[PDB]
Amino acid sequence: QDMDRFIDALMKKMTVEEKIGQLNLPVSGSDVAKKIEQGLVGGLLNLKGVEKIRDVQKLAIEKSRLGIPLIFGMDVVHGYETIFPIPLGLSCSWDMEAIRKSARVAAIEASADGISWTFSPMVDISRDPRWGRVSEGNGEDPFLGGAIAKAMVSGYQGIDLNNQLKRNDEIMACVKHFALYGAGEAGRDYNTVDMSRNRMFNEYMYPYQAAVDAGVGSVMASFNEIDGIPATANKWLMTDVLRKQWGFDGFVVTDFTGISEMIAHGIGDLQTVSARALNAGVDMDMVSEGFTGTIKKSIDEGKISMETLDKACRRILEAKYKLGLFDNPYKYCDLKRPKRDIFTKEHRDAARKIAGESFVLLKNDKSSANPTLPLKKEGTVAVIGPLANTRSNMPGTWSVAARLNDYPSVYEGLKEMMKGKVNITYAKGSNLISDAAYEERATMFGRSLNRDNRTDKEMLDEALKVAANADVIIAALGESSEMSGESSSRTNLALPDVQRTLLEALLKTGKPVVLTLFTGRPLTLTWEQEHVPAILNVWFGGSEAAYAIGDVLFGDVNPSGKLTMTFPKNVGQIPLFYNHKNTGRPLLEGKWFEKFRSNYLDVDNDPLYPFGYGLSYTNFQYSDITLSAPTMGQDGSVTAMVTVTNTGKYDGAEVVQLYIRDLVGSITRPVKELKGFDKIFLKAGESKTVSFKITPELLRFYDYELNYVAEPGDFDIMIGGNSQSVKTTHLSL
Amino acid sequence: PQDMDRFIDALMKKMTVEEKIGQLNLPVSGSDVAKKIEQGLVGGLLNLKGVEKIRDVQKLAIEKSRLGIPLIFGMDVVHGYETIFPIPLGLSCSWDMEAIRKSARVAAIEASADGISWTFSPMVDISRDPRWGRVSEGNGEDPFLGGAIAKAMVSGYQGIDLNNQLKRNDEIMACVKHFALYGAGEAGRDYNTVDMSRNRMFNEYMYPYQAAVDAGVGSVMASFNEIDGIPATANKWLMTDVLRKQWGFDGFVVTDFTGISEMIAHGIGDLQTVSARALNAGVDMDMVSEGFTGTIKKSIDEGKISMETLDKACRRILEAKYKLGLFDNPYKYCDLKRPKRDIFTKEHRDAARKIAGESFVLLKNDKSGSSANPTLPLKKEGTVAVIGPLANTRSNMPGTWSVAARLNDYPSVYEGLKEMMKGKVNITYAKGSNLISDAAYEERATMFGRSLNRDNRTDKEMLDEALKVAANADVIIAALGESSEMSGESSSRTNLALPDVQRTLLEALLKTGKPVVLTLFTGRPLTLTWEQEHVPAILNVWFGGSEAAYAIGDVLFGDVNPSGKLTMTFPKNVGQIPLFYNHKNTGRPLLEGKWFEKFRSNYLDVDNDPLYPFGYGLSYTNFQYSDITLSAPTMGSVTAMVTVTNTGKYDGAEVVQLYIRDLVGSITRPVKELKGFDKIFLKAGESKTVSFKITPELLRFYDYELNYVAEPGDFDIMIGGNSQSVKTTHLSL
Numbered sequence A: 001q002d003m004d005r006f007i008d009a010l011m012k013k014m015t016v017e018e019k020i021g022q023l024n025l026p027v028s029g030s031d032v033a034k035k036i037e038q039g040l041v042g043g044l045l046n047l048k049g050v051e052k053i054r055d056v057q058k059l060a061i062e063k064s065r066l067g068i069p070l071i072f073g074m075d076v077v078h079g080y081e082t083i084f085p086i087p088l089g090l091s092c093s094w095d096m097e098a099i100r101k102s103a104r105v106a107a108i109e110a111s112a113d114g115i116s117w118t119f120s121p122m123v124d125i126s127r128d129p130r131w132g133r134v135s136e137g138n139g140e141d142p143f144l145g146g147a148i149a150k151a152m153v154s155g156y157q158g159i160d161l162n163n164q165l166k167r168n169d170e171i172m173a174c175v176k177h178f179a180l181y182g183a184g185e186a187g188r189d190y191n192t193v194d195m196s197r198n199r200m201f202n203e204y205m206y207p208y209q210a211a212v213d214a215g216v217g218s219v220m221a222s223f224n225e226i227d228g229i230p231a232t233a234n235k236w237l238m239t240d241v242l243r244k245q246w247g248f249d250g251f252v253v254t255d256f257t258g259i260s261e262m263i264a265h266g267i268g269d270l271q272t273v274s275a276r277a278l279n280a281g282v283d284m285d286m287v288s289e290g291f292t293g294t295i296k297k298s299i300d301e302g303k304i305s306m307e308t309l310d311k312a313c314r315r316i317l318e319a320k321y322k323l324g325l326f327d328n329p330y331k332y333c334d335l336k337r338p339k340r341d342i343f344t345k346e347h348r349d350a351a352r353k354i355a356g357e358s359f360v361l362l363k364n365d366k367s368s369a370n371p372t373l374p375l376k377k378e379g380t381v382a383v384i385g386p387l388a389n390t391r392s393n394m395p396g397t398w399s400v401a402a403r404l405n406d407y408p409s410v411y412e413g414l415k416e417m418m419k420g421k422v423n424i425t426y427a428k429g430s431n432l433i434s435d436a437a438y439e440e441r442a443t444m445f446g447r448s449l450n451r452d453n454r455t456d457k458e459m460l461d462e463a464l465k466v467a468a469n470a471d472v473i474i475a476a477l478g479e480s481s482e483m484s485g486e487s488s489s490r491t492n493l494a495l496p497d498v499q500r501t502l503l504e505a506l507l508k509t510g511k512p513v514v515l516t517l518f519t520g521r522p523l524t525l526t527w528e529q530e531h532v533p534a535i536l537n538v539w540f541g542g543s544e545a546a547y548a549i550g551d552v553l554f555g556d557v558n559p560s561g562k563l564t565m566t567f568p569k570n571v572g573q574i575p576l577f578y579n580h581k582n583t584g585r586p587l588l589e590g591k592w593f594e595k596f597r598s599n600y601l602d603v604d605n606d607p608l609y610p611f612g613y614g615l616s617y618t619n620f621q622y623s624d625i626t627l628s629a630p631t632m633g634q635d636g637s638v639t640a641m642v643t644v645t646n647t648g649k650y651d652g653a654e655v656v657q658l659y660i661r662d663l664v665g666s667i668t669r670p671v672k673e674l675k676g677f678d679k680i681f682l683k684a685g686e687s688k689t690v691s692f693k694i695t696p697e698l699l700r701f702y703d704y705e706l707n708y709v710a711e712p713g714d715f716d717i718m719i720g721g722n723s724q725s726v727k728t729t730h731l732s733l
Numbered sequence B: 001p002q003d004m005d006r007f008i009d010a011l012m013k014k015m016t017v018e019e020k021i022g023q024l025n026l027p028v029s030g031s032d033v034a035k036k037i038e039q040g041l042v043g044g045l046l047n048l049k050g051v052e053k054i055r056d057v058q059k060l061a062i063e064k065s066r067l068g069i070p071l072i073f074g075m076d077v078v079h080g081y082e083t084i085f086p087i088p089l090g091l092s093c094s095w096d097m098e099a100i101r102k103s104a105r106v107a108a109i110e111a112s113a114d115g116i117s118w119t120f121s122p123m124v125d126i127s128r129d130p131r132w133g134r135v136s137e138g139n140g141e142d143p144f145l146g147g148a149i150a151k152a153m154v155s156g157y158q159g160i161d162l163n164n165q166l167k168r169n170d171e172i173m174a175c176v177k178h179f180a181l182y183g184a185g186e187a188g189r190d191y192n193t194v195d196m197s198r199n200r201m202f203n204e205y206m207y208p209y210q211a212a213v214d215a216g217v218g219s220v221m222a223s224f225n226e227i228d229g230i231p232a233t234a235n236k237w238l239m240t241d242v243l244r245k246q247w248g249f250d251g252f253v254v255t256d257f258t259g260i261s262e263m264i265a266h267g268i269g270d271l272q273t274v275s276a277r278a279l280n281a282g283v284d285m286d287m288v289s290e291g292f293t294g295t296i297k298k299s300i301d302e303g304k305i306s307m308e309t310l311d312k313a314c315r316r317i318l319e320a321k322y323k324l325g326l327f328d329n330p331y332k333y334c335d336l337k338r339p340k341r342d343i344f345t346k347e348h349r350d351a352a353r354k355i356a357g358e359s360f361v362l363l364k365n366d367k368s369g370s371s372a373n374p375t376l377p378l379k380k381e382g383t384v385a386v387i388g389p390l391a392n393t394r395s396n397m398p399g400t401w402s403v404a405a406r407l408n409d410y411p412s413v414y415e416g417l418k419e420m421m422k423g424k425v426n427i428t429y430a431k432g433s434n435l436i437s438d439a440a441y442e443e444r445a446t447m448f449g450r451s452l453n454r455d456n457r458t459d460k461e462m463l464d465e466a467l468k469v470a471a472n473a474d475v476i477i478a479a480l481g482e483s484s485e486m487s488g489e490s491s492s493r494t495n496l497a498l499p500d501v502q503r504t505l506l507e508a509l510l511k512t513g514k515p516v517v518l519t520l521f522t523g524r525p526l527t528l529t530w531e532q533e534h535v536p537a538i539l540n541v542w543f544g545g546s547e548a549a550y551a552i553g554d555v556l557f558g559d560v561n562p563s564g565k566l567t568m569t570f571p572k573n574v575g576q577i578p579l580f581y582n583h584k585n586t587g588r589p590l591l592e593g594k595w596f597e598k599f600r601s602n603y604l605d606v607d608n609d610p611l612y613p614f615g616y617g618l619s620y621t622n623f624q625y626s627d628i629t630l631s632a633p634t635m636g637s638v639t640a641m642v643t644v645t646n647t648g649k650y651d652g653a654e655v656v657q658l659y660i661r662d663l664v665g666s667i668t669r670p671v672k673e674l675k676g677f678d679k680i681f682l683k684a685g686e687s688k689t690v691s692f693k694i695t696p697e698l699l700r701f702y703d704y705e706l707n708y709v710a711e712p713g714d715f716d717i718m719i720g721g722n723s724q725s726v727k728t729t730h731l732s733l
Ligand SMILES: [Mg+2]
Pocket: A662, A663, A664, A665, A666, A711, A712, A713, A714
C-alpha cells in the first residue's frame, strides 16, 4: 500500500546499475565515498562512531543522484560497550526475559552510535565442542535455541510483529548462519557439512525458523556447503525453505566475502557463482563485489532476469523503509545520544545481574564439612591463574566495540568490591599454555597476557608463596577468549597443560580451591570433577564479569545457570548429545561395559555433565507429575504439573525442564526432547507448582516424507532439573 | 535359463504357507534345531562347525522333513578358515587384487571342505572413523579401492566367470555386508546412528556394495544401523529401490544377528509390525530373530503382507539353493575325506605368509647415530630381543574374526622368529608390560580366548626384566600395539594411542641406546606422532594371520621387501576425526605451508594434515616416477602413462596410484579421488612403464539430482606413490 507505492516510484527512477548497487555491501575502509557518489553502495558494515556514520550518510543523501540512505551494520553479538556474557553463557541463564533485555540494551547502545543493523543473533545448533563458534550460539537443542532466537530478535527489533523498528533504539537483527554451520565436519571452522533432510528439520533448522517467525529483518547465508552446494548458492534453502515454506519477507545477505569463496569451493568463476547466488535468493553481497562486478553482464547474457534483480533490490529498499530511513536518513545519528545511552550504570547493573544468573555451578563439595561455596566475607582470598588479572579477556570473543583495556579483571574487581571485608591477593601462577606460539595466536585481537620469560617453576613458586598467605584459593583458569569464536577450532578440549599443573599444586596446599572456569566451549573435565572441591563455569561474563563472579562466590547471588550444551568425557565421544536415537542395541542403565551393545571399550556412554545440568547453593525437591488426563482426545490438550520445594538453606532459582519421549515412531525418535522450561525463584523452605500445557503441536516432528505430524501412540512426559533427573508420567494421543 | 524356474515352480506349488515362511528362517545351531527342521521351519543354519555334524543335520532336512529341502550352512569366514590371512584392513594394504582373490579362494576351499556353503563376507563398509573397531574387517576409506576388493573377494569365493559360478564343490556363496553405511556410525560407536545425504551416500559410501552385486554376489546382509531414521532392515528405499530396481540385484537379503527384533529397541514398533515392514522392504531371510516365523502368516491373514510378497522372498531362498547345486546334490559339501586334504596344508599356509609379508606397511625406517644403514632390514646375526605383550601370544596372531581358527596352533612372534632364524640369530624374549594398566580393560580386550595370562607382577618388575634381556641383545623388536579383540565388532575406542604401560615400556627400550623396531599390531589407524618422532623404525604388521610371525621375519630380516600401502588415513589425533584423503576444498582452504592462519579452515592446536596419508607406505628401496605422458590433451579414451625406476639397492614391489581431480563441478567435488592403481615389481635398477586408461565412465559422479554424469571441463590427472606426492598433468572433457 504505502510502502509498495513508495518503492514502486523510487524503483521507476533507478537504472539497472543503481539497482545492482543497492545489493552491494562493502566495508567503509575518502575511498568509499566515490562508490556512494556513483550510486554503488547499498549499505556499510564495520564503520564505528555516530559522527562518522552521519557524515557518510550525508554523502549518500546529498551526493548520490537518488539520495537513497544507507544501512550501517556491525557484529553486536553480546553487547556494544556494556558487554554481556558470550551467547553460550547467556543461554545457560534459561531466562528468556533477561535475554531479551540484553538485546534491548545492545540495540540501545549501538543505535546511540549510529548502527541500525546487527549481525546477530547466531542460532546455529552445535553438537561438536571443537568448533569455537559454539560460544556465539545457544547450545545443542533446537527448542531452547528457538526461544532464544525469539528473545534476541524481539529484543533488538521490538516485541510486536506489526510494530517493530519504529523507535530510534530498535535496530534490524540478522539471524545467522543459515544453515547447519555448526556441523562443520571434525569441528574445523568452514569445513564440509553433510546430513539428511530429516535430520536438518527435526534437529537443526528450527532456530532459524523461530527467528523468521519472530520478525527478523535479514538472514545471513553460511560459509559451509550443504548437499554439495555452498549455502550462498543453494536455491532450495534460500528460496524453497526460507521463502516458500517459512514465509520470510526480508532479505538475504552473504557472510564476509561469501560469494567469491564459492570459487574456492569448486563450483565455477565469479560470474557463474554470482548469478547462482542471486538466482538462489541471495539479495546482498558483503565485500565480494560479485554482484556489482557481474550481474549486469549476466543479465546481458540472459543468465539473470530483470525480475530476479528487481526482487532483490526491492527487499533492500523495503528494509530501509521499515527502518524509517526514507522518512529520516539520520534516525540513528544523534550525536547527543552516546553520552546518554552507552555504558550507563543501569545497563551495567543489568549485565552484571544476568552474568551471575548465567554462571553454572558444576561442583560444590567440602574442603569443616560445609560446602566450599559460598565463601565467607573475611580473611585472605588469593586469585591465582592466567585469567586472574587480565582485563581484555573478560568480555569474551566477538565484542568488537568493547573497551578491552577499561573493564576490571577478576583480581581488580574483587579487590574493589571486597574493600574493607576481604584481603584479595594475586599470583599469575602459569602461562596460558606452555607453547608460546600457541598462546600468541590464542590471545590476538588485543587479548595478550604479556607473557614473560619466567620459568614455569618461578611462577609456580610465587603462586605457592602467595597461597600460603591465604585461606581460600580462587583458581582463575581455562581459555583465553580468543581460544573460541571464529576460526578457533580445537582438537583438544582439556585445561591447558601448565594450568592443570598449576591447579594440582594449588590442590596440594590443602587449602580450599574454587576453580573459576573461563571458556567458550564445553571442556573435558573428568579430572577436575574428581579432584577440585568447587567448580564454577563462568564462561566469559562480559564487561561486569569480575563483580558477578564476586556476587556468586560470596553468596550475594545464588547460582542458577544450567548447561545448554553437553560436556563429554573425552574428545572421542563427539558428537555426544542428549537427544539421540535409541539404536537397536542400547546399553541399558548401569551395564557398561557389555559386549555386543552400543558402547565403547575404554569409557562409558555418559557425558560428564548432561544437557540442563546446574547445581545450586540450595537443593530442590520434586513431587511426582500430575497429568490432567492420560489421553489427549479428552480435551485436545493436557497439563503436566509438579511442585518444587526448596529444601536447603538458601533462597534460590531452579530451571524446571520439560522433556518428552515419543516411544514408537514411523521412524526412530529421540529418547527425549526438550519441549518446555520454566525458571522459578524459591525462598528457602517455600514450594511452588510448575505446570506445562501439552498440546498436539508440541508432539509434532518431520516424518520420513518430511510431513510435520503427530502420530497416535504413547509418550513419556518428564519434568526435572536436568535431562538425567526427571519424574516420568505417561500420555497417549 | 528356464530349467531353474520350472523346478522351483514345481516345488513351491507343493508348499504350505508355513513351509514357505520356514525357508525364511535362519537360526543358530545350538535335537539342537532338529525339532524345528523336522517341522519344515528352517531355511538354513549358521555357526555349525564340522562337516560330519553338518552332514548329519543336512541328512535330517533331506530325510526327516516332509519336503526334503536341503539347508545352507553359513559362517563368518572373513579372512580365513584355519589358514588365517591378515585381517581385511591389513589385507587391503597389499593393493594386490590377484593375491586377494586367491585368499578368498583358499578360505572357500577350506570352508567348503568342512561343509560350509555360505560365508558372511566380504565386509565392504566404507569408514573414515578409526574409533570403530570394525574397520579391521573392511577395505579402508576409499570406494574405488573398496569396490575392487569387493570383486576380488566375491570372485574368490564363488568363481571368476559371473555366468559360471558356484558349480564346483570348492566355490561357496558370498554375502556382502553390511548394506548399508554401517561404517559411519556416529561418534565411532558400533550400532550407533548413521545420518548423511543421498548425495554423500552414492559419491562416497555406496559403490562397494554395488561392485559386489556386479561381481555376482549371491546374498546381501542388512546392517544394524538406521538410515534416514529407518533401520536398514526396514528400509524399502534401500532394499528394493536401490538394491534391486537400480542395481539389478538378483539374490536374497539376510539380516544381521537378530536384526529384525532389535528394531523394537530402534523404536519403530512391535515384533509383528517390524517383521512385516522388513519383508515388505525386501528382506528375505531372518537371522535368529524368529520374526518371520513368529508373525508373517498372522500379517498375511490380517492383510498386511501379500502372498506374492511371501512367494518372492521364498523363491530367492530356493534359487540360492539351486544355484549352489544343492537340490541336485544336497551333500555337495559333505566329504568327510576333504578336511585332511584341503585344510591347513603347506600350500595354503605358504600363500598366507606371502600375502601377509606383502601387506605390512613400512611406516618409518630412519638411520640413527653413526649407522651407515637404516635399522631395517635387520642383519641375520647376533641377538635380537622380542619384547612386549604381543611378542609371545599365539592366540592374538590371527586377528579378530577368525572364528574357525585354532588359537593354540599358530606360532607367536617370538616362536616363529626363533625357529625360522635358528643358527643365524639368537632370539630372546621379555614380556615387558601388560597390555594396558586397567586389568578389567585387558580382560575385555582379550576375551574369546585371547588371554595374555596377566600376572600379579608390578610394572617395574616386568620393566626390569625386559631391560635385562635388552642389555644382552643387539637389536630390539618392540612387539607392541593392540590385542586382536580391541578391534572387531563392539570394540570401539575413544582413545587411539599406544596403551599407557606399553608406551612406558617403549620409552625405556628407546633409552637403552640399542636399535629399536616398533612392530605394531593393530586393527585400526592409531595416533602415533610421538612414535613417528622417537622410534627409528616402525612396521605396521596389522594382524598377519596364522603365518604372521614367519612373515614378520621375512620382512624384518630382508628376504621380503615391504610393499604395503595404507588404505586408511592415520590422523595425528582423535580431534581430527573424520580425516580422509578425498575431502572437499571448502571456501577458505588453508594453503600449503600456511598453518596457522586465522580465518582459514584450520585448527588452533594442530595442522590439517594426517600423520600418514592414504596410499602411504615405504620400501627398503626407492621408486622414482617420470612425468606423465598423456596420449592426448582432451578426451574414445586417453592414456595416462609414467615410467617407474627402482633406483635403490633391493628388488621390491611398488603400488602406483592414479588420482583425478574434477576442478569445477555443479556441486563441490573432492580435491582428489583414487581412480586406478597397479602393483608392479622391479628388480634393483629396473624400470617399468605404468599406463592407465582414462574414459568418461571413469569421470562420472552423482550430481545434485543423483544423475550419474561426467561434466565437460577440466581435470587434473595424477600418478604417484601415495595420495600426497604425485606427478600432475591435465585432461579436458
Ligand atoms: Mg509415536
